[model samples]
Target: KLPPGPTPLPFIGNYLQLNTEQMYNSLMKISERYGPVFTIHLGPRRVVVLCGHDAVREALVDQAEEFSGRGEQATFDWVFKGYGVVFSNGERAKQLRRFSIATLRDFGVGKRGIEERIQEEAGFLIDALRGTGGANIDPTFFLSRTVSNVISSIVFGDRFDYKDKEFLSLLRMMLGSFQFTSTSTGQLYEMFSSVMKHLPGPQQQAFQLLQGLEDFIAKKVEHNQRTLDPNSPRDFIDSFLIRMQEEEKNPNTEFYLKNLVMTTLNLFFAGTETVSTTLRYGFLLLMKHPEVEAKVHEEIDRVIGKNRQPKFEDRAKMPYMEAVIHEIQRFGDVIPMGLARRVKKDTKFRDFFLPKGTEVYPMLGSVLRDPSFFSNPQDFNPQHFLNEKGQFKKSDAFVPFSIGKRNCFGEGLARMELFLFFTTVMQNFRLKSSQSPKDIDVSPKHVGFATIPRNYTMSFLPR
Candidate 1:
């Protein structure tokens, strides 16, 4: 039995009923009437939205195996084509995911020594900000480049200089795809991809941008293949190529050129955008609340001081900073709808019966904003992550990276980057906004596929 939902018209279904600008919030309103676990339509297809912490947790965590299906959406098919870790399902996804995790670990992601790489990049970021002369400037690319280089170190086995023209151009192209996908038009193309394919629009442009990135990755793979040493894998590409050779005789190997390109693209694109955006958005939040910024500065001075780089080991020593970062992630609410997943088999969830291949949206927004868990879910308050003793507290409800088996593979790396970058910035400079905190609207300027914070200018005045 399909879950009950609002009545739908023939062709459009609930497509016209939704406000694509804030689709996750729109769905929450619908869930109020239909209950937490329910179905909704987009064009001819159906999607099951798991709203709130319990419902989302029930589907994604407790019953992870049954709900672990991927590759059932138009946008996913259009981009990944069931080839990479983000979209591919079944054994192929399993194999790629396992290998990718192991490879990243071996390459120093989520390790203590990786702190040196982040600190080195953070130095470049601080130098760039210092060069801004206390003038109001958009810090997007500065943060993006710093964060991107961290992932680049792992994937490409090297970091690009901030002034590298080729690297900056490639980063812009990659970010364009992310921006376009979060627009209403992007959602339209994703839902009605079959129809949109014949039309000329931003979707095609986004596809072109992705194609360019893939081409870049392919060349890198080629170079790595020529120089790859089996015993001493330089990075992810070299490791993947080694696996490809080992599995060459196997007919059903997922270790092929296409998967290699798409997987690297997944790592590079996702690894860069989400963390950088969080940092950008977090700074904006801090600027709006100078008191919060001051508190962070106080913690940095007391804990790490002005003499040394912030390390991951220091995360626990400073509870206030930890709380602030957690609040930023929850408040920024990145990946609010989480990534869409497919039903692996015809199965019962709660009172509803979902069939095989049904696309499911586990709304991370619902979890992040659950009134039961947060005192003021809508406001940006570090208190959300703090205890009565003013110590950092964690809640299962705080899942910015979504939950379940398919949760972000780079969670460890992203956390490290966030802690190091944010602290390093606070340690070196004070975030100053020309506009009044009340006037600065920290609400996402655009909300489509992702909630993008409005662009703003602020000075990183030396402390």
Candidate 2:
């Protein structure tokens, strides 16, 4: 009844067939031979992969309800234990989504508070970059610290000082979690968590690092507990704690101490790297394609002059900048295949019958690169998002944040961060790469869970 695929050998399944280092390429290769909807075995677990725009759209959007389930992520589930939003499924996921959306809106998203928070941090970032004095510098932690502090503002109710050693360590540890997952050992752990758990390696170090991060979050929750203002909730943790007590009378509640700690961890991690890494990569792309950057600069000059800060509303006024940002997200493709989903119930998709719990991977990379939608998909051309008049054009195939109810709930916040951080940076500085534009490599360094820009240094020349 399952879709067709390469024959698997016993326990190893399709591990031999898959290039763990580059699963995206491997999956694309398999899809070429097996069509859009097909099965692949990772270790003993058998599941389906959805490639191309049509197949992914039909399954995720057309029949949204049937495929709403979050698929199994062994190591992720091991830490989150399906308690938080990113990993939880079914009712738990539903409740968390509703609460998080409401809380984010109440706190700031389309509101002044969150935008000002990001703008303030943007000021901090500019000051920091200005301190670089036109010398080559790695923008990694500079962007990381700035972006992570925005999350801290929302969840932890305050921002960490740029020089805070603890905050720096936490940032490094957070990155370690993402980087480790892309390694061979991390890939093996995801395949056989039970077997890998007992083994010694950096993965164990990752476990301890996360455990320490969780413990750090728990202390922050305790701090909120010490100064409880039932009437005035301070931040996310406060709001969740208030909600926890309000729902205390209910015998079965999703809001609890563990859920609070884990969810805060989720928000911090989710909010941290995505926008920052995208911006980091965005800078690299702008350097690679100076023409695109020049157009964006022209737009910034025409609309938002150097006298003012960039706002989310400016995104509409500056269409070229918008296209550039969209192209950056499309080309950068941060979380290539960050997570997966499962089918909620037995159903027929197209001509095939899928069982109740089939794992499905919506290849966003495939959709972003679909030739039918994008004429020159491989190249970084903002024209893909711009029409003849140079206005921003919307493409149905551009599902960077994904589609349907289960799409990235962090989208609103991330969008604000992206537009503000990106526009503000471009307004202030001219990104100068150490090597020539042709010499700079825009390709990803790691091609596993995330498609990160290759590690390279550049100077941020003050305008």
Candidate 3:
């Protein structure tokens, strides 16, 4: 009993029918008639669309094991090369994930140990923004650089200075690859991966950028190898290298250099984009709604005081700021379509029969913007996460990081960064767009793998 969906035409399937620019909305529109659970074809591949919170929860949470498989889109084959945690499966994924989690824990990712690092970096970030001298500036690279440094600290036991030329070039390449992968050309590569491999375009450039990143990692790994103290692991790379040495006799070990490179790449790449973009969009939201910004300032002043920087502990005391951060993530709608998953085995979902290997997309946009959970789901309202008492609130439907076993491993660190970075910045600066609130368009400029906010120059007035 396959789920009902639009009929596919020949090899193109539903590719011609989809609005690639707004793919999640297109899936929702199709769901209106077919019901929440349905299938859609992108080129020759069949994908099951899990729309709304209930259906997505049922699969990702209720039946975690069956839907635990990580599905790879064809284009990512070129990017990840099936070696890292993101695309690996079975024992390889489990082993790498366990090692990565333990390593991140040791380095103070989710724990209190890393707060000082984030706060320190936040200071650097604020100072960099202050260097803007209240002139209108694009905040993308600054935010990206700050976020990248945090991951670098964790992965390589070092952070790049924002002014470092090599670091800036690497940042540009990583960001460019991210943007390109979400474009139509990137989508085309996913659909026709084999054919595109022979052709040249942004997809090839994306791979080139990936190779550049790999080379960068390879060099870092070589350095770690020379300097590593077997007894004391400096960071993730050192830890993994030590493990590789310990497991040298075991052919079954996944702790080789390739896995280390790709997994570190995954951490670096994933850590940078989502957090920075969220911050960018959050600022844009504040720009479009100064009332929200004012409220945030009011809370920051009351909770942390005007003279002090916000600490992680202050998050609990400042409900409005918490609500604003939560709303920013909700409203930002990054990764709206959610990450891709695959059926671990042939599964029966509701009345539909899905075979093993079917690609599944828990359309997070549908859940994030569902009218059932949020009033005026389309509107960017911090009130969505706040109750009448003005305290911070949460809904099960808020799943920007996704849910279940496949949920983002970097979630804890990302939250720490978002809370500290956002609060500290808000405490020191007021974001103002020269364009009127009505003229400020906060809608996503591109809606592909991620919702990229349209770039805008804004004055970061010191408060």
Give per-residue CA lDDT, model 1, range 1-463, as digits (tens). Answer: 7988888878677886787666776788999998988888877768988888999899999999899987354554566787888888889889999999998888888786677888889999999999998999988898999999988988899999889998887888767878877788877765677788778988888888877888899899999988889999878888898999999999999999999988998999888999988999999999999899989988999999999888899998999999999999999987878888888999788868899999898889889999999999999999999989998898999999888888888999899999999999999999888799899999897766777899888899999
TM-scores, in order shown? Answer: 0.98, 0.97, 0.98
lDDT of 1 at 27: 88
lDDT of 3: 0.87
lDDT of 3 by residue, 52-159 (tens): 999999999999999999987666578677799888888988999989999999999877789889988999998998888999888888998998999999998989
| Candidate 2, run of 10 with poorest lDDT | 182-191
Per-residue lDDT value at 202 in model 3 = 78
lDDT of 2 by residue, 135-247 (tens): 99999999999999888988988999988999998988788877777666676666667677888887788887787788889999998999989999989999999999999
The parts of candidate 1 lying over 4 Å away from their true place are: 71-73
Ten-residue stretch with the least lDDT total in model 1 = 70-79
- Please state the error at residue 166 of candidate 3 in Å: 1.2
